[PDB]
Amino acid sequence: MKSLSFMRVLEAVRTMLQEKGGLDVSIVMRNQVEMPTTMIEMIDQEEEESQTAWKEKYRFAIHHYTNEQDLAGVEKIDTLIQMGFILPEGYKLVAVRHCGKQNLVKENTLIHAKTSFEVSICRELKVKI
């Protein structure tokens, strides 16, 4: 079964977020922004090592910008992402773990919280016939 591109993962996570949290989340990543929002950045994608199944690790990021320190929003996004989401048929979401940089900085006139996630997706089992 062909490897799933990061674009499908992005669509799936956007749909899960908007459906279960009512969150308007954009996928396109920007550099210089304004006004509070929530944005998803795909970092990278690689192959994990397991001699049982074809498995891939997708690392993405969630940028939450807001003029106020919003604890509830970041905690809710944490809960929703760590809960898991639906994938296109033929893929299994195995593990969602934190990895990479976790940051809470203030830029210009608003606070920027960066939360990086690493999700494991299995596509097929490594067995002959």
Binding site: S50, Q51, T52, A53, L125, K126, V127, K128, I129
Partner: protein, 147 residues
């Protein structure tokens, strides 16, 4: 020529009880075939030289296959039946790429064991001990039933 045969293209196949269907054991991940011959000592000290004299003895064979374990596949529902009833099993080696058989014979299931690590899938291991001649199908015409 081919210059190689990929390891994911040779599989172990088991004959069902009636012998009608060649079931490929599901979850195959590894396979090794051992074929050995004993050596006798004809070392008699009336011979010039200084080297030890030997001849060939008896031949036997064995097969070890391990992989992922699923208990619902008909292949694994037969291996248990053969194991419990002590009946000889018919085993074949299929190069599912070139569509040619490799080695067929009668074997006895000497071991049927399996492991369940908590962070992996449940894996199974099977040892088959040789019962009689292991017909080399690469040197003998025939033996190409595919399933």
């Amino acid at each position: 020529a081919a210059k190689a045969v990929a390891g994911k293209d040779v599989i172990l196949a088991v004959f069902n009880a009636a012998g009608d269907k060649l079931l490929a054991v599901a979850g195959q991940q590894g396979l090794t075939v051992n074929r050995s011959k004993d050596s006798i000592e004809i070392t008699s000290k009336d011979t010039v030289g200084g080297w030890k004299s030997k001849i060939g003895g008896m031949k036997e064979w064995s097969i070890e296959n391990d992989g992922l374990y699923v208990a619902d596949a008909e292949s694994h529902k037969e291996l248990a039946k053969y194991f419990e009833s002590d009946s000889p099993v018919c085993v074949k080696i299929i190069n599912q790429a070139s569509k040619k058989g490799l080695f067929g014979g009668l074997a006895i299931v000497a071991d049927y064991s399996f492991e369940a690590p908590f962070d992996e899938a449940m894996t199974y291991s099977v040892k088959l001990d040789g019962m009689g001649a292991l017909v080399d199908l690469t040197i003998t015409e025939g033996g190409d039933q595919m399933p």
